[PDB]
Amino acid sequence: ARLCNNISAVTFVSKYKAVCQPIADQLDLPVENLLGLAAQESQYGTGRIARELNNYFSMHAPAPLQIGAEAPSIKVAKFDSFQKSAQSFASSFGTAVRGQRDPMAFAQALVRSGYNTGNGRDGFARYLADIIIAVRGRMAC
C-alpha cells in the first residue's frame, strides 16, 4: 500500500521493469536488483544524468556503448537509452555481480567490483538492499 503511494517511484518502476528483465536474466540476478540499482543512481528517473543523458547507472566515462561524455574532475557517460546504460553496466560490472541474487550480497559485490567504493544510519549495502526490496514491492503497483 504505502509503497504504491509514491507516484514518482511507481512510475519509474512500471516504465523500466520489463526492459530490465533480460539483462538481469543474463547476469543471473533478480530483476529488482538491477532495477533497484537504477532507482538508486537515477533517483527513480528524476536525476538530470538519467533524464538528459539516459545514464540510469551514473556510469563514469568512458563506458562501453556510450555515445558521448559530459562533466556533471570526472565525466559521466551519455547513452542512447535506459537499455543501453543497463547494457553498459552489464558490460563493465556484470561478471563481477553475476549470480549475486541476495540483495546484500549484490551490494557487497558492487563494492568489490569498484562500481562504488562504498567506504545516516545504515551502511552502503543495507541502504541499497532496502531500495531493491522497495522496488520489488513497487513492481506490484
Binding site: S92, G114, N116
Partner: protein
C-alpha cells in the same frame, strides 16, 4: 536565505529548501565539505516539476575516481511549507534541534502545519 523576513508565506524557494536540508545534514554528519561530494536539487518529473508535490527533492552523492559510477548517500524531500525533511528511501524523518528551530520559523511564516500537508506527505510513500 533563511531569515524569517526572507521566507515568503507561499513557502520556501528551492534554494531555501536546500539550505534547510544542509542544516538537517549537519546533525547527521554526512561530510558535505569533502571533495567529490554534492547536493543536487535538479530533480524533475516529465513536466519539469518537483517529483513530490509539496516538497523539493535533493540527492546527496559522491564521485570518486577510483569508482566507476556515482555513489549516492541519500534522496531527500523538503517541505516548502514546513521544512519537514525526509530521506525517502530509508523513510526516515530527519531531526535535530537546529532543524526543528528552522521548521518552527518556516511554519510561523507560512501559517501551515504538518497536518495541513498530510496528503502530500503520504505521497512520499513512507507512512500509511
Amino acid at each position: 536565505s533563511l531569515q524569517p523576513a526572507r521566507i515568503k508565506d507561499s513557502g520556501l524557494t528551492r534554494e531555501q529548501a536546500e539550505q534547510v536540508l544542509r542544516v538537517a545534514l549537519k546533525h547527521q554528519d554526512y561530510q558535505l565539505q569533502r571533495p567529490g561530494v554534492f547536493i543536487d536539487g535538479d530533480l524533475q518529473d516529465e513536466n519539469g516539476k518537483p517529483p513530490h508535490p509539496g516538497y523539493y527533492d535533493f540527492s546527496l552523492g559522491y564521485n570518486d575516481p577510483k569508482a566507476g559510477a556515482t555513489e549516492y548517500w541519500g534522496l531527500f524531500s523538503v517541505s516548502l511549507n514546513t521544512g519537514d525533511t525526509w530521506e525517502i528511501n530509508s523513510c526516515k524523518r530527519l531531526d535535530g534541534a537546529e532543524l526543528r528551530a528552522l521548521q518552527r520559523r518556516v511554519m510561523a511564516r507560512t501559517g501551515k502545519s504538518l497536518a495541513d500537508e498530510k496528503s502530500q506527505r503520504e505521497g512520499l510513500g513512507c507512512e500509511d
